[PDB]
Design a protein around this nucleic acid. Structure first.
Ligand SMILES: Nc1nc2c(ncn2[C@H]2C[C@H](O)[C@@H](COP(=O)(O)NP(=O)(O)OP(=O)(O)O)O2)c(=O)[nH]1
Ligand SMILES: [Mn+2]
Ligand SMILES: [Mn+2]
Length: 430
DNA sequence: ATTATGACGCT
DNA sequence: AGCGTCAT
């Protein structure tokens, strides 16, 4: 009872840009705004592959991973923007720079953890304590939460979407105890006020819209963010968890969408996250290992301890290219030329990183995939990265992979390579 | 012939 | 160190 800690110590937000690459292209080209639009890489094969889709286009069934020619079958007026090509490969520099714009704005409010190119976690606990001090017990006006949903409300005792939103928000605000500066629900509410302000700043200063989740930990904040996309934020309280999880497929929780989640379902004969509560911590550890078992026991009760890392920059800088089917690399000249192309892009990104961020990579990881291997990587080898020089980097990558070529002939490469991947790692302050 | 990344756990 | 999992 009283000693049963409830995982309500922190206020954590997850901010995720809506259809990010599409918004970057729509900012640049106003003719694409408020249209069914998608972003593609390459063009020759089946019109290129879609990696981002505006919400107007999603209404027609267009999705990521779809070939553009097939998307056009669902949505003949779909507009398309292509990712830049440089040195023979996709070049994502425009989107990385746009990401930096957004991350620098978020960092004004709190220290952030960059979780992907378009989303970050925020630990708002301290900022909330400060805003609460300023409020002096003043209640929170619904006007301060103009885009916030309260998950689970309204309940009990109505036709439009905004009206339901406001109804739920009114129920939440009316039930709040604002004289208690340690009430977790009040703390989440103040966190949501701050996130409204953060999202307003991002849109004013970049033109980009985003969604957000506010809860007591990272997993719940991420789940909350997706409940009301686009251009809205969602508060998931500790009390909302039993009902939310009672019908929540296990695969919707981040990290359970793969083999482990499938094993949870199959071994335990369950479907929904809330069903996990009926097992003891030791039972879960017995099936899924000590770490996963403890994590599942706490997570199905809404509790998670993973901290928001103070990390605004990526930990690695990498360059990769697939060579599918008949384009697979089958000569030594070919393998060298593409290693050089990747190495030249890597050098350009690394030099810019050293200038911006006062650090230097020290290890180069070379990964290849070989024809007939279904795995992502067939082989990974590391070497030292001592100079930001593309010719040296590519010569070293060739040296560390050259023993793969099973061909007796010096010129041929067998079996042919279907992927090259160079990744700079182990950064040190410079 | 999804592709280009990036984080992180295991041994 | 090199491999596997998860995400998307
Ligand atoms: N190159 C590449 N980029 C990708 C891939 N998948 C996603 N991206 C890029 C393109 C995406 O714009 C961006 C962010 O990924 P999300 O947050 O998962 N999707 P979004 O922001 O589009 O829509 P939502 O409003 O539902 O969040 O990452 C991929 O497989 N390959
Ligand atoms: Mn997004
Ligand atoms: Mn994202």
């Amino acid at each position: 009872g009283p000693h049963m800690a409830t995982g309500q110590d922190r206020v954590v937000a997850l901010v995720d840009m809506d259809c990010f690459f599409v918004q970057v292209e729509q900012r640049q080209n106003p003719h694409l705004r408020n249209k069914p639009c998608a972003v593609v890489q390459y063009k020759s094969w089946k019109g290129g592959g879609i990696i981002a889709v505006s919400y107007e286009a999603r209404a027609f069934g267009v999705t990521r991973s779809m070939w553009a020619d097939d998307a056009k079958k669902l949505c003949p007026d779909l507009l398309l923007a292509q990712v830049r090509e440089s040195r023979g490969k996709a070049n994502l520099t425009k989107y990385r720079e746009a990401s930096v714009e957004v991350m620098e704005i978020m960092s004004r409010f709190a220290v952030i953890e960059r979780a992907s190119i378009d989303e970050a976690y925020v630990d708002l606990t301290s900022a909330v304590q400060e805003r609460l001090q300023k409020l002096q017990g003043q209640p929170i006006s619904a006007d301060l939460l103009p885009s916030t949903y309260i998950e689970g409300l309204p309940q009990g005792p109505t036709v439009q979407k905004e009206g339901m939103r406001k109804q739920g928000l009114f129920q939440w605000l009316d039930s709040l105890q604002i004289d208690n500066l340690t009430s977790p629900d009040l703390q989440l509410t103040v966190g949501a006020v701050i996130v409204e302000e953060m999202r307003a700043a991002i849109e004013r200063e970049t033109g980009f819209q985003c969604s957000a989740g506010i809860s007591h930990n990272k997993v719940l904040a991420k789940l909350a963010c997706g409940l009301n996309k686009p251009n809205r934020q969602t508060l998931v309280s500790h009390g909302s968890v039993p009902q939310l999880f009672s019908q929540m497929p296990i695969r919707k929780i981040r990290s359970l969408g793969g083999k482990l989640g499938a094993s949870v379902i199959e071994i335990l004969g369950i479907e929904y996250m809330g069903e996990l509560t009926q097992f003891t911590e030791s039972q879960l550890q017995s099936h899924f290992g000590e770490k996963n078992g403890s994590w599942l026991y706490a997570m199905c009760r809404g509790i998670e301890h993973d901290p928001v890392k103070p990390r605004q920059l990526p930990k690695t800088i990498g360059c990769s290219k697939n060579f599918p089917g008949k384009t697979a690399l089958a000569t030594r000249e070919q393998v060298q030329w593409w290693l050089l192309q990747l190495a030249q892009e890597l050098e350009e990104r690394l030099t810019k990183d050293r200038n911006d961020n006062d650090r230097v990579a020290t290890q180069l990881v070379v990964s290849i995939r070989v024809q007939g291997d279904k795995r992502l990587s067939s082989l990974r080898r590391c070497c030292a990265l001592t100079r930001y020089d593309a010719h040296k980097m590519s010569h070293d990558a060739f040296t560390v992979i050259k023993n793969c070529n099973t061909s007796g002939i010096q010129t041929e490469w067998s079996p042919p390579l279907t992927m090259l991947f160079l990744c700079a790692t182990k950064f040190s302050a410079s």
